[PDB]
């Protein structure tokens, strides 16, 4: 039986260094932006509106994303196998999804608030009670949609793949934590559900509401209106393009049959860039919502 031996540190020092730098940049930016946004909101007791509450929730979710996703996934990309353990793999798989879904849903909440306040100028504003209920409902929906990820996560022991301990010829086995599924079709269905519930529907809602806002504003165009339209278009296009690569790779891996060579190439070389883009998308949200908001500027 042919067996494959790999080193403990999977990548060369140069590629490992570039991965470390690339992830550390966005991690640092995310932590600084979220910390400063939360500090400003807490310092300003007067700023306690519904939109500010949604921004604070988004900042907290982005901080959770930056803490519980980037370092663990960078370590996974660097060192071969899964050495943390089954319990930690389950916990991380639950928390990463929870934070990602909360971050995505807060965007739709903010967009619907802005649409309600701009398009409908006479209708009553949303109350704090409704805002808190919406926060709870988005957290509950995230838990409901990504409980199965923690349900079916499990570490598997490998036999054909072995690892050198870099010396003394210690031939350690490979621990590969994965989302076990009785049927590959079941995993495909769950991945499609996540795709439709995280990337498609929020995008459609955001783009439709921003288009309605722009049409209502259009009905001489001042610099304020042009700036608002530019910001809205930038937000929509960024949310599309940043998240496109990761979801494309996931759907391709779970839907399209590829040879082992190209599958390994995808899983080793191009997945880190998609993960980096997806994490940087949530990292940049505090800076845009605290820099292009005149309330935070003052």
């Amino acid at each position: 039986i042919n067996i494959t031996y790999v080193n403990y540190y999977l990548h060369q020092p140069q590629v490992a260094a570039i991965f470390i730098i690339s992830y550390f940049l966005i991690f640092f930016l995310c932590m600084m932006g979220n910390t400063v946004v939360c500090f400003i909101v807490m310092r300003n007791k007067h700023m306690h509106t519904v939109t500010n509450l949604f921004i604070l929730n988004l900042a907290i979710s982005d901080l959770l994303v930056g803490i519980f996703c980037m370092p663990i996934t960078l370590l996974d990309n660097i060192i071969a196998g899964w050495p943390f353990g089954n319990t930690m793999c389950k916990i991380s798989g639950l928390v990463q999804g929870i934070s990602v879904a909360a971050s995505v849903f807060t965007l739709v909440a903010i967009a619907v608030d802005r649409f309600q306040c701009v398009v409908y100028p006479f209708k009553p504003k949303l109350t704090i009670k409704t805002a808190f209920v919406i926060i709870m409902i988005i957290w509950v929906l995230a838990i409901t949609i990504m409980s199965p990820s923690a349900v079916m996560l499990h570490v598997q022991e490998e036999k054909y793949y072995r690892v050198r301990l870099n010396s003394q010829n210690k031939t350690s086995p490979v621990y590969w934590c994965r989302e076990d599924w009785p049927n590959q079709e079941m995993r495909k269905i769950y991945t499609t559900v996540l795709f439709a519930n995280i990337y498609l529907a929020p995008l459609s809602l955001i783009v439709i509401m921003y288009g309605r806002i722009g049409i209502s504003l259009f009905r001489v165009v001042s610099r304020k209106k042009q700036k608002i339209i530019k910001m809205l278009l930038i937000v929509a296009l960024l949310f599309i393009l940043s998240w496109l690569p990761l979801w494309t790779l996931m759907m391709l891996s779970d839907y399209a049959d590829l040879s082992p060579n190209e599958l390994q190439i995808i899983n080793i070389y191009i997945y880190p860039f998609a993960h980096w883009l997806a994490f940087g998308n949530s990292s940049v949200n505090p800076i845009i919502y605290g820099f292009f908001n005149e309330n935070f500027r003052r």
């Binding site: 663990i72 996934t73 798989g93 999804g97 054909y160 490979v174 989302e179 590959q184 082992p260 899983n267």
Partner: peptide, 11 residues
């Protein structure tokens, strides 16, 4: 499938 293709986590 069942093979260590260096598959990372979903997120």
């Amino acid at each position: 499938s069942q093979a260590f293709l260096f598959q990372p986590q979903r997120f």
